[PDB]
Amino acid sequence: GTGKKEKSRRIREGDTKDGNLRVKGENFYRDSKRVKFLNMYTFQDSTIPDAR
Amino acid sequence: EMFKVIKTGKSRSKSWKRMITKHTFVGEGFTRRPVKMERIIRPSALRQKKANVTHPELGVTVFLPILAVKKNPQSPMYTQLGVLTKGTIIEVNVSELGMVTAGGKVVWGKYAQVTNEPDRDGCVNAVLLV
RNA sequence: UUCCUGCCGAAGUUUCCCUCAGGAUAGCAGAAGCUCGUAUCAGUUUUAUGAGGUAAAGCGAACUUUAAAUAUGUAAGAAGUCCUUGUUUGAACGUGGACAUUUGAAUGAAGAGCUUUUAGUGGGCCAUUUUUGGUAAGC
RNA sequence: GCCCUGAAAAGGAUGGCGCUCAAGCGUGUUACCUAUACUCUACCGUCAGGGUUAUGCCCUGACGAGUAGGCAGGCGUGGAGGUCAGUGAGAAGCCUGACAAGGUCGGGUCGAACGGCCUCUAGUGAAUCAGCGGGGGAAGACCCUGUUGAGCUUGACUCUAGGUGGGGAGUUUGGGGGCGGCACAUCUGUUAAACGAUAAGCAGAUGUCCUAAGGGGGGCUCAUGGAGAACAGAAAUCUCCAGUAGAACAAAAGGAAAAGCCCCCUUGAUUUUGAUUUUCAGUGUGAAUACAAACCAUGAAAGUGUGGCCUAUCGAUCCUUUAUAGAGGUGCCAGAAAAGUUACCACAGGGAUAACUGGCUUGUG
RNA sequence: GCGUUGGAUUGUUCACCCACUAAUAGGGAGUCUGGGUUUAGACCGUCGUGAGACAGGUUAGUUCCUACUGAU
RNA sequence: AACAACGGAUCUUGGUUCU
């Protein structure tokens, strides 16, 4: 900190008002649009859909 | 298992890969992306462009190009994937029959439902929804 | 990771779950418990009813009365009912008392309901009796 | 009703022997085996019903399986109080023939203290030798779970007049995308604007096709005054004139052979893709928005529309006037928990098996 | 019943070629050798702010008990 | 089953605690 802390960045950007959408890994590098993309590198629910 | 998992890397512990074992049609706009992005893999051998089409009229079957897929039930994410998944409704180039609707506007494309199971057969059968 | 005799004696189901995980929780059975030993309880039969109205009586070849068991809950009385109105020709909360135990069908005979709490057991393996959705067949 | 074809292979299944007027099959009748079942008789323990000047005894009847678990009682064992004025120059111990924890005696050894009972207490229960090597010493592999410990990078949380301030340290790194949908004939509490009419909503037994819009097509004109019309009158019905149209034209406004009522139809959230975005195999659109040109209704035709509106959880007492309560509103806050990595990682296990459901495969979509 | 041979690739040998014979039949019951299935150590590129691991890939490799054949 | 090398358990001036 002080600037390095992500809380200060969130307060400055105003995203704290909508922090409910805080994605795991929200940082300056590799924001949600990239964190979600990378998470795909980490389909078998065997659900029974009604094909009507 | 239809979303078959293929083990990646020398040490098979981070596969993350899913392969569709169902017939799928894409067309010209396939353009395989870099190998790193192949989250879903539709094998070329399991891709068909011409599906058999028939109607209860004259009993004439003619192979016609597949135009597109509009509505696949049971999680239409398969529709977005273009999988056949017998029971789907797909558009077919019916220009060969040349049937003309009222008003002189010749029709050349109609939606048809796949009758046979392409997963268990090497041919695709559909019936015109006329 | 510890001797013996006798008695009783289970659980694998149920609620909260943003949830594999983790928690008790209602239930299964022995107990301090005394209030009733009852005219009290029943995985039960029957009498009256709604439904499987499955079609074979139809008497209305028009149509709905309605015939079998196909298994259901309810009333089957002990102060329940009644003489009497204490109170605002007709309504109700009716003191006091009476029919007192063939006292309100038959069958089993006293372990039935405790306000309360004790250690274990947590969503087990199989088959049959119903039909729902199947599709090669499993399910 | 049987037998034969009706498909099976890399010491099995009528169990084996075997059997043919069967010892194979369907069916009617005789004699018998047997389970810890059934009936009786005796023995061991529980309960209940009764007697006995008594926590003891006697007479009668039924029960007795069993894991976790509970309940009511006994034996042995370390030590101690009391008691048998106990046992022994032959005591304690060992092994062994006898009379349910366990106790007693004779017999081969023995040499120095050791017991019975009522209680207290607690560190108490044939047969071999020489050779190849099919099976069973590296035992861990390893899918994953521990949050048990660290190996680390950082705009991850926490610190280190104003500022840089993992350079440094402690820590985690849980167990989730679509959804809201109705309009008129009614009566009731509020609203009610208070001489009233009774409107512009809340919730209700109430339906109904208006297909949650009435769009088109064909017709009617109307609140209210007079003459009036059996009950019926000031409000029920039935006919002549007009509201410049106080009807509904949602309506706010300078304002119709209908835009109000009646009879028929009726999808619409249809299709491709010419401007905008967004992925995760950037996917010729996969899609709503923008619009294009068809499709449809309707009519005899000109014609008109019909093809969507709209919106992040949750707060409501995390806001208030309140010091014992009624809520008007997220355009007023702040987030559910502070990111990954480790075949450098170490340890313990829930753990697929060589290849058998209900014979599981065979030549003909 | 008796036979079913021999060369060949590797810039993978999930297989094809041709010498001779009359033919060079198809499988299971795994059982000395080589790829490889695994931690050795490193490299090129991918991906990321980085640790870290891969869409590839190369190098290095270590894993008498019972039954049979003869004899006393 | 009894005899014999072997073996070391039970029935020992020791330790603990206390003033």
- The DSSP line for B108-124 is -EEEEEE-S-GGGSSS-
Name the DSSP class of A29: S
DSSP B47: B
- Report DSSP letters for B53-110, one per residue: EE-TTTT--EEEEEEEEEE-SSSTHHHHHTB--TT-EEEEE-TTT--B-TTS-B--EE
For the beta carbon of residue B79, count every other beta carbon within 10 angstroms. 19
Contact list in B for residue A42 (CB cut-off 8 A) is 14, 16
Q: Do B16 and A41 touch (CB under 8 A)?
A: yes
B-proximal residues of A, 1-52, CB under 8 Å: 40-44, 49-52
Which experiment gave this structure? cryo-EM
SS3 of B39, please?
Answer: coil
Number of Cβ within 10 Å of residue A24's Cβ equals 8
Report the candidate in A51, A46, A8 with the shortest Cα–Cα distance to residue A28: A8
Cis-peptide, bond into residue A2, ω within 30° of zero: yes
Enumerate residues 6+ apart whose C-beta is below 8 A from B16. Answer: A40, A41, A42, B8, B39
Q: Yes or no: say if B67 and B44 are a contact pair by the CB < 8 Å rule.
A: no
Across A30-49, b (16+ Cβ under 10 Å) vs e yields eeeeeeeeeeeeeeeeeeee
Region of residue B48 (phi > 0: left; psi between -120 and 50: alpha; otherwise: beta): beta
Q: What angle do CA B22, B26, B28 make, to 5 degrees?
A: 150
Instruction: Let me know: does A26 contact A13? Beta carbons within 8 Å.
Output: no
Chain D positions with an atom below 7 A of a protein C-beta are 143-144, 154-160, 163-166, 173-174, 271-272, 279-284, 286-287, 294-296, 312-314, 331-336, 338-341, 343, 365
DSSP code of residue B24: B
Residues of B from 28 to 87 whose C-beta is within 7 A of strand E: which are they? 35-36
What is the resolution in angstroms?
A: 4.7
How many Cα atoms occupy the beta-carbon half-sphere of B49 within 13 Å? 7
Residues 6+ apart with CB under 8 A from B25: B47, B48, B49, B66, B69, B82, B84, B90
